[PDB]
Design an enzyme around this catalytic site. Structure first.
Site, PDB file in Angstrom:
ATOM      1  N   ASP A  52       9.974   7.853  -4.851  1.00  0.00           N
ATOM      2  CA  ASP A  52      10.755   8.989  -4.355  1.00  0.00           C
ATOM      3  C   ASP A  52      10.274   9.584  -3.030  1.00  0.00           C
ATOM      4  OD1 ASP A  52       8.405  10.155  -5.201  1.00  0.00           O
ATOM      5  OD2 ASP A  52       9.335  11.592  -6.565  1.00  0.00           O
ATOM      6  N   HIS A  75      -5.465  -5.727  -2.488  1.00  0.00           N
ATOM      7  CA  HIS A  75      -6.801  -5.790  -1.876  1.00  0.00           C
ATOM      8  C   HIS A  75      -7.203  -7.186  -1.421  1.00  0.00           C
ATOM      9  CE1 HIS A  75      -7.861  -1.643  -3.891  1.00  0.00           C
ATOM     10  NE2 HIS A  75      -7.023  -1.530  -2.877  1.00  0.00           N
ATOM     11  N   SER A 102       7.406  10.597  -2.312  1.00  0.00           N
ATOM     12  CA  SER A 102       6.424  11.677  -2.459  1.00  0.00           C
ATOM     13  C   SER A 102       5.231  11.493  -1.491  1.00  0.00           C
ATOM     14  CB  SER A 102       5.895  11.738  -3.892  1.00  0.00           C
ATOM     15  OG  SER A 102       5.331  10.515  -4.280  1.00  0.00           O
ATOM     16  N   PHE A 115       8.056   8.445  -9.952  1.00  0.00           N
ATOM     17  CA  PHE A 115       9.290   7.926  -9.367  1.00  0.00           C
ATOM     18  C   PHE A 115       9.039   7.457  -7.947  1.00  0.00           C
ATOM     19  CE2 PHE A 115      11.250   9.608 -13.026  1.00  0.00           C
ATOM     20  CZ  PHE A 115      10.758  10.892 -13.212  1.00  0.00           C
ATOM     21  N   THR A 131       3.922  11.749  -8.132  1.00  0.00           N
ATOM     22  CA  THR A 131       5.097  11.503  -8.980  1.00  0.00           C
ATOM     23  C   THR A 131       5.317  10.007  -9.231  1.00  0.00           C
ATOM     24  OG1 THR A 131       6.647  11.363  -7.116  1.00  0.00           O
ATOM     25  CG2 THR A 131       6.297  13.610  -8.007  1.00  0.00           C
ATOM     26  N   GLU A 151      -6.556   6.570   5.559  1.00  0.00           N
ATOM     27  CA  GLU A 151      -7.628   5.700   5.085  1.00  0.00           C
ATOM     28  C   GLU A 151      -7.819   4.495   5.986  1.00  0.00           C
ATOM     29  OE1 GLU A 151      -8.115   1.713   3.072  1.00  0.00           O
ATOM     30  OE2 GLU A 151      -6.261   2.828   3.213  1.00  0.00           O
ATOM     31  N   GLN A 153       0.798  -1.201   0.000  1.00  0.00           N
ATOM     32  CA  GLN A 153       0.000   0.000   0.000  1.00  0.00           C
ATOM     33  C   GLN A 153       0.850   1.280   0.000  1.00  0.00           C
ATOM     34  OE1 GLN A 153      -2.755   0.776   3.171  1.00  0.00           O
ATOM     35  NE2 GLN A 153      -4.279   1.452   1.798  1.00  0.00           N
ATOM     36  N   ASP A 162       2.388   1.752  -3.517  1.00  0.00           N
ATOM     37  CA  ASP A 162       1.373   2.150  -4.483  1.00  0.00           C
ATOM     38  C   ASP A 162       1.122   3.667  -4.369  1.00  0.00           C
ATOM     39  OD1 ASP A 162      -1.712   1.135  -5.764  1.00  0.00           O
ATOM     40  OD2 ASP A 162      -1.501   3.053  -4.762  1.00  0.00           O
ATOM     41  N   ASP A 190       2.976   6.016  -3.186  1.00  0.00           N
ATOM     42  CA  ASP A 190       4.087   6.816  -3.620  1.00  0.00           C
ATOM     43  C   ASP A 190       4.018   7.001  -5.181  1.00  0.00           C
ATOM     44  OD1 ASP A 190       6.957   7.405  -4.523  1.00  0.00           O
ATOM     45  OD2 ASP A 190       7.348   7.043  -2.413  1.00  0.00           O
TER      46      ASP A 190
HETATM   47  C1  HEM Z   1      -7.085  -1.908   4.411  1.00  0.00           C
HETATM   48  C2  HEM Z   1      -6.167  -1.573   3.448  1.00  0.00           C
HETATM   49  C3  HEM Z   1      -6.592  -0.874   2.092  1.00  0.00           C
HETATM   50  C4  HEM Z   1      -7.690  -0.071   1.911  1.00  0.00           C
HETATM   51  C5  HEM Z   1      -8.670   0.274   2.950  1.00  0.00           C
HETATM   52  C6  HEM Z   1      -7.690   0.265   0.538  1.00  0.00           C
HETATM   53  C7  HEM Z   1      -8.583   1.149  -0.084  1.00  0.00           C
HETATM   54  C8  HEM Z   1      -8.601   1.689  -1.400  1.00  0.00           C
HETATM   55  C9  HEM Z   1      -9.585   2.620  -1.968  1.00  0.00           C
HETATM   56  C10 HEM Z   1     -10.817   3.203  -1.277  1.00  0.00           C
HETATM   57  C11 HEM Z   1      -9.214   2.914  -3.203  1.00  0.00           C
HETATM   58  C12 HEM Z   1      -9.840   3.814  -4.256  1.00  0.00           C
HETATM   59  C13 HEM Z   1     -10.635   2.950  -5.205  1.00  0.00           C
HETATM   60  C14 HEM Z   1     -11.191   3.712  -6.373  1.00  0.00           C
HETATM   61  O1  HEM Z   1     -11.865   4.756  -6.067  1.00  0.00           O
HETATM   62  O2  HEM Z   1     -10.965   3.337  -7.544  1.00  0.00           O
HETATM   63  C15 HEM Z   1      -7.922   2.149  -3.429  1.00  0.00           C
HETATM   64  C16 HEM Z   1      -7.200   2.172  -4.560  1.00  0.00           C
HETATM   65  C17 HEM Z   1      -5.963   1.597  -4.780  1.00  0.00           C
HETATM   66  N1  HEM Z   1      -5.449   0.689  -3.995  1.00  0.00           N
HETATM   67 FE1  HEM Z   1      -6.086   0.141  -2.104  1.00  0.00          FE
HETATM   68  N2  HEM Z   1      -6.622  -0.245  -0.096  1.00  0.00           N
HETATM   69  C18 HEM Z   1      -5.968  -0.981   0.833  1.00  0.00           C
HETATM   70  C19 HEM Z   1      -4.863  -1.683   0.543  1.00  0.00           C
HETATM   71  C20 HEM Z   1      -4.088  -1.658  -0.621  1.00  0.00           C
HETATM   72  C21 HEM Z   1      -2.976  -2.471  -0.827  1.00  0.00           C
HETATM   73  C22 HEM Z   1      -2.317  -3.416   0.257  1.00  0.00           C
HETATM   74  C23 HEM Z   1      -2.485  -2.187  -2.086  1.00  0.00           C
HETATM   75  C24 HEM Z   1      -1.190  -2.684  -2.776  1.00  0.00           C
HETATM   76  C25 HEM Z   1      -0.408  -3.677  -2.360  1.00  0.00           C
HETATM   77  C26 HEM Z   1      -3.411  -1.195  -2.591  1.00  0.00           C
HETATM   78  C27 HEM Z   1      -3.350  -0.656  -3.930  1.00  0.00           C
HETATM   79  C28 HEM Z   1      -4.255   0.330  -4.492  1.00  0.00           C
HETATM   80  C29 HEM Z   1      -3.983   0.959  -5.740  1.00  0.00           C
HETATM   81  C30 HEM Z   1      -2.896   0.926  -6.777  1.00  0.00           C
HETATM   82  C31 HEM Z   1      -5.177   1.863  -5.948  1.00  0.00           C
HETATM   83  C32 HEM Z   1      -5.275   2.851  -7.111  1.00  0.00           C
HETATM   84  C33 HEM Z   1      -4.546   4.175  -6.682  1.00  0.00           C
HETATM   85  C34 HEM Z   1      -4.657   5.207  -7.697  1.00  0.00           C
HETATM   86  O3  HEM Z   1      -3.835   5.211  -8.683  1.00  0.00           O
HETATM   87  O4  HEM Z   1      -5.636   6.002  -7.592  1.00  0.00           O
HETATM   88  N3  HEM Z   1      -4.473  -0.991  -1.749  1.00  0.00           N
HETATM   89  N4  HEM Z   1      -7.561   1.452  -2.291  1.00  0.00           N
HETATM   90  N1  LIG Z   2      -9.863   5.750   1.180  1.00  0.00           N
HETATM   91  C1  LIG Z   2      -9.773   6.834   0.407  1.00  0.00           C
HETATM   92  O1  LIG Z   2     -10.121   6.811  -0.766  1.00  0.00           O
HETATM   93  C2  LIG Z   2      -9.258   8.118   0.989  1.00  0.00           C
HETATM   94  C3  LIG Z   2      -8.088   8.166   1.744  1.00  0.00           C
HETATM   95  N2  LIG Z   2      -7.674   9.335   2.251  1.00  0.00           N
HETATM   96  C4  LIG Z   2      -8.371  10.459   2.036  1.00  0.00           C
HETATM   97  C5  LIG Z   2      -9.545  10.413   1.292  1.00  0.00           C
HETATM   98  N3  LIG Z   2      -9.964   9.251   0.778  1.00  0.00           N
HETATM   99  N1  LIG Z   3      -4.254   1.390  -0.788  1.00  0.00           N
HETATM  100  C1  LIG Z   3      -4.633   2.364  -1.598  1.00  0.00           C
HETATM  101  O1  LIG Z   3      -4.181   2.472  -2.725  1.00  0.00           O
HETATM  102  C2  LIG Z   3      -5.628   3.367  -1.123  1.00  0.00           C
HETATM  103  C3  LIG Z   3      -5.825   3.583   0.235  1.00  0.00           C
HETATM  104  N2  LIG Z   3      -6.713   4.499   0.610  1.00  0.00           N
HETATM  105  C4  LIG Z   3      -7.407   5.194  -0.292  1.00  0.00           C
HETATM  106  C5  LIG Z   3      -7.222   4.980  -1.645  1.00  0.00           C
HETATM  107  N3  LIG Z   3      -6.324   4.078  -2.038  1.00  0.00           N
HETATM  108 CA   LIG Z   4       6.374   9.099  -6.157  1.00  0.00          CA
END
Ligand code: HEM
Ligand SMILES: NC(=O)c1cnccn1
Ligand SMILES: NC(=O)c1cnccn1
Ligand SMILES: [Ca+2]
Ligand SMILES: *[C@@H]1O[C@H](CO)[C@@H](O[C@@H]2O[C@H](CO)[C@@H](O)[C@H](O)[C@H]2NC(C)=O)[C@H](O)[C@H]1NC(C)=O
Ligand SMILES: *[C@@H]1O[C@H](CO)[C@@H](O[C@@H]2O[C@H](CO)[C@@H](O)[C@H](O)[C@H]2NC(C)=O)[C@H](O)[C@H]1NC(C)=O
Ligand SMILES: *[C@@H]1O[C@H](CO)[C@@H](O)[C@H](O)[C@H]1NC(C)=O
Ligand SMILES: *[C@@H]1O[C@H](CO)[C@@H](O)[C@H](O)[C@H]1NC(C)=O
Ligand SMILES: [Zn+2]
Length: 595
Positions: free
Chosen positions: A188, A351, A190, A186, A184, A258, A105, A108, A110
């Site tokens: 890095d 996820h 961020s 990279f 960003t 989050e 997480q 991702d 970053d």
């Molecule tokens: C309890 C832990 C986590 C919660 C609650 C969570 C929650 C979320 C939520 C709410 C979104 C936005 C979904 C959308 O609106 O499309 C998201 C997106 C994302 N999640 Fe998670 N996540 C968790 C763990 C992780 C993990 C462990 C990974 C990677 C190993 C991860 C990778 C991502 C990625 C790449 C996105 C897209 C980010 C972007 O480019 O906007 N998540 N996550």
């Molecule tokens: N879970 C989320 O999408 C999120 C995390 N931090 C701020 C706002 N929304």
């Molecule tokens: N794990 C994530 O990528 C994430 C976490 N919180 C909100 C949105 N995305």
């Molecule tokens: Ca970055």
């Protein structure tokens, strides 16, 4: 024919070519094309976008419009029939700590962030989408299927807003919609320092010339620092408990609060920056604020890169690690460092690694208090449990001693995320991340499963029997075929995650290829990669080589017992040791003598 490109919304660039440090926006990294990898520009398209109207409408927008001759199934119906499960027993990963899921997480965060569109200000446009479930413009509601339990208790749908896109916020009409990466590309740090100048400054402590990041002045963790509160209202963290009234934290990344373990990871990184800054100050009393801050920021960036490429990727990609990310050969300015739109979905394999509960453990690594274990959903946007319930140490012990969930074809995503997700501005613990991921996949105009299989040089199943062989699962392929009538229509998030994991890894062949190719580019196309000759001196690199997540914990918490390989499953007290037998980061090579 293919144009030089758009970018009216995008900012102008000026570059200090002498600068030994990264910009905060990522600009200037690549010298020939300064905007490559910079935040707030379009995610890269490895393959042409696939939209229902070729330009911007997602498949599933128009009911009568098919994809390859078949209607796309509702995101929530695929979630209910394939992604969900009841029995959490036996679902844990016997050889990955909970830290493995959390670091994924962090990494991702970053790299990519594609925020929902901004139009809800001084508007019920957001209020209407939710209250009435009427599809329009940026409102793309997730409709519940007929037999859905949520239809009985939550209405007709779950609100969902389309991701922000480049150039006009308002829809364009000659070229395919391109979603924005707000951070960003990279690796890095961020997520710690921010990807915008405006935010980057607000996180710094400029009251003193010590190059420190600002810290909470309202609360402390037994003398240790907390992140400052974001005093923006409304606050989802205050909303989850109006009695505790503890707001979310303010970090380099917008999503830091989050879930409690992410906020916890961000806290350790912030503590690390100040600890590095203080230390540098001692060794080089002559260095000013900007210097200290840029130097500590640069070391933290390298730490993140090392833990990621050395400890994390090998145990994600297993046997495919070598194939896609060969040992480092130096900086290649011909490589596209930009995160691809498909990678933002591939990386969501995390996820399926999130377990149903989180534990707080005491110095014996035994349940801390009476309610030591808690359901994951009570922990989304939960800051109060950290500030008013023991600090971060009991949580960090849980990250080391408890296990990640193991991906399972029959138990994909825990209901804590599949049925009880909390979204800010929405009032309930009743959302579905798996459905949101599938609806998003469509929002972004993702090509289907077979297009990506082709892109990775893998077979493209056309029948149920063919899909059964690829997934090595008769029942799962049969549910997928019943829902998507052809493998060609299977959304990449679900298709990629349905594949059996490669040897020594945690993702299937298709994801290993999409992830591997991305990380290879992220490393090879970064002028500031830590191992690129000249970024750090050779002695500095000898010192960085020793970094470990165990050492990170020792130096920034009051935990004195830690495992040597924090990502593997570790049991107390056998796999644990005193912080004294663990390599330290030696900042001697940073002593710059001049005279
Ligand atoms: C309890 C832990 C986590 C919660 C609650 C969570 C929650 C979320 C939520 C709410 C979104 C936005 C979904 C959308 O609106 O499309 C998201 C997106 C994302 N999640 Fe998670 N996540 C968790 C763990 C992780 C993990 C462990 C990974 C990677 C190993 C991860 C990778 C991502 C990625 C790449 C996105 C897209 C980010 C972007 O480019 O906007 N998540 N996550
Ligand atoms: N879970 C989320 O999408 C999120 C995390 N931090 C701020 C706002 N929304
Ligand atoms: N794990 C994530 O990528 C994430 C976490 N919180 C909100 C949105 N995305
Ligand atoms: Ca970055
Ligand atoms: C910015 O830095 C200054 C200086 O370090 C902080 O002020 C001090 O607060 C510390 C706690 O860290 C106290 O022990 C001292 O009384 C102060 N120290 C000095 C050297 O003056 C200030 O809190 C920081 N501000 C923010 C927002 O982080
Ligand atoms: C919201 O936060 C408050 C404040 O910490 C929680 O109240 C505490 O919980 C238990 C009692 O169940 C005690 O250990 C604390 O001393 C309580 N403090 C107070 C002032 O009551 C409360 O449980 C939280 N509520 C929710 C819904 O999360
Ligand atoms: C540098 O990158 C380009 C473009 O990806 C690639 O074709 C080339 O092989 C790389 N150079 C080396 C020496 O590997
Ligand atoms: C446990 O994980 C590590 C990699 O983190 C690996 O070296 C070791 O072989 C694993 N054990 C088993 C039985 O898979
Ligand atoms: Zn303490």
């Amino acid at each position: 024919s293919w144009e030089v490109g758009c970018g009216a919304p995008v900012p102008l660039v000026k570059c200090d070519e002498n600068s030994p440090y990264r910009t905060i926006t990522g600009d200037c990294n690549n010298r020939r094309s300064p905007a490559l990898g910079a935040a707030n520009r379009a995610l890269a398209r490895w393959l042409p976008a696939e939209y229902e109207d070729g330009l911007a409408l997602p498949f599933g927008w128009t009911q009568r419009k098919t994809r390859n001759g078949f209607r796309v199934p509702l995101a929530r119906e695929v979630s209910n029939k394939i992604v969900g499960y009841l029995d959490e027993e036996g679902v844990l990963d016997q050889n990955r700590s909970l830290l493995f899921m959390q670091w994924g997480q962090i990494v991702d965060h970053d790299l990519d962030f594609a925020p929902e569109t901004e139009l809800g200000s001084n508007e019920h446009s957001k209020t209407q989408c939710e209250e009435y479930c009427i599809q329009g413009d940026n409102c793309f509601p997730i409709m519940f299927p007929k037999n859905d339990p949520k239809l009985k208790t939550q209405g007709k749908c779950m609100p969902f807003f389309r991701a922000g896109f480049v150039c006009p916020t308002p829809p364009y009409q000659s070229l395919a919609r391109e979603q924005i990466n707000a951070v960003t590309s990279f690796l890095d740090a961020s997520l710690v320092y921010g990807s915008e100048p405006s935010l980057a400054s607000r996180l710094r402590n400029l009251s003193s010339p010590l190059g420190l990041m600002a810290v909470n002045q309202e609360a402390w963790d037994h003398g240790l620092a907390y992140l400052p509160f974001n005093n923006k209202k409304p606050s989802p963290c205050e909303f989850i408990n109006t009695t505790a009234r503890v707001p979310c934290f303010l970090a380099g990344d917008f999503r830091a609060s989050e879930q409690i373990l992410l906020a916890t990871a961000h806290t350790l990184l912030l503590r690390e920056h100040n600890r590095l800054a203080r230390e540098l100050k001692k060794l080089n009393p002559h260095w000013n604020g900007e210097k200290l801050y840029q130097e500590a920021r640069k070391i933290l960036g390298a730490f993140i890169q090392i833990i990621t490429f050395r400890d994390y990727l090998p145990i994600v990609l297993g046997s495919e690690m070598q194939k896609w990310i060969p040992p480092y050969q130096g900086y290649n300015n011909s490589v596209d460092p930009r995160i691809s739109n498909v990678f933002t979905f591939a990386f969501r394999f995390g996820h399926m690694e999130v377990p149903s509960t989180v534990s707080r453990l005491d110095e014996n690594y035994q349940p801390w208090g009476p309610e030591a274990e808690l359901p994951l959903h009570t922990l989304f946007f939960n800051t109060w449990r950290i500030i008013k319930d023991g600090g971060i140490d009991p949580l960090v012990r849980g990250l080391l001693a408890k296990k990640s969930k193991l991906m399972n074809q029959d138990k994909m995503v825990t209901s804590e995320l599949r049925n009880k997700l909390f979204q800010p501005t929405h009032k309930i613990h009743g959302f579905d991340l798996a459905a949101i991921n599938l609806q998003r996949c469509r929002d972004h105009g993702m090509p289907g499963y077979n297009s990506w299989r082709g892109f990775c040089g893998l077979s493209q199943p056309k029948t149920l029997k063919g899909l059964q062989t690829v997934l090595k699962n008769k029942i799962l392929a049969k549910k997928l075929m019943d829902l998507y009538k052809t493998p060609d229509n299977i959304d990449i998030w679900i298709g990629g995650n349905a594949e059996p994991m490669v040897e020594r890894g945690r993702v299937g062949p298709l994801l290993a290829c999409l992830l591997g190719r991305q990380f290879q580019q992220i490393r090879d196309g970064d002028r500031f990669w830590w191992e690129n000759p000249g970024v750090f001196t050779e002695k500095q690199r000898d010192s960085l080589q020793k970094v470990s997540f165990s050492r990170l914990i020792c130096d920034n918490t009051h935990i004195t017992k830690v495992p040597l390989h924090a990502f593997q499953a570790n049991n107390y007290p056998h796999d644990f040791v005193d912080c004294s037998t663990v390599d330290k980061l030696d900042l001697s090579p940073w002593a710059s003598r001049e005279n």
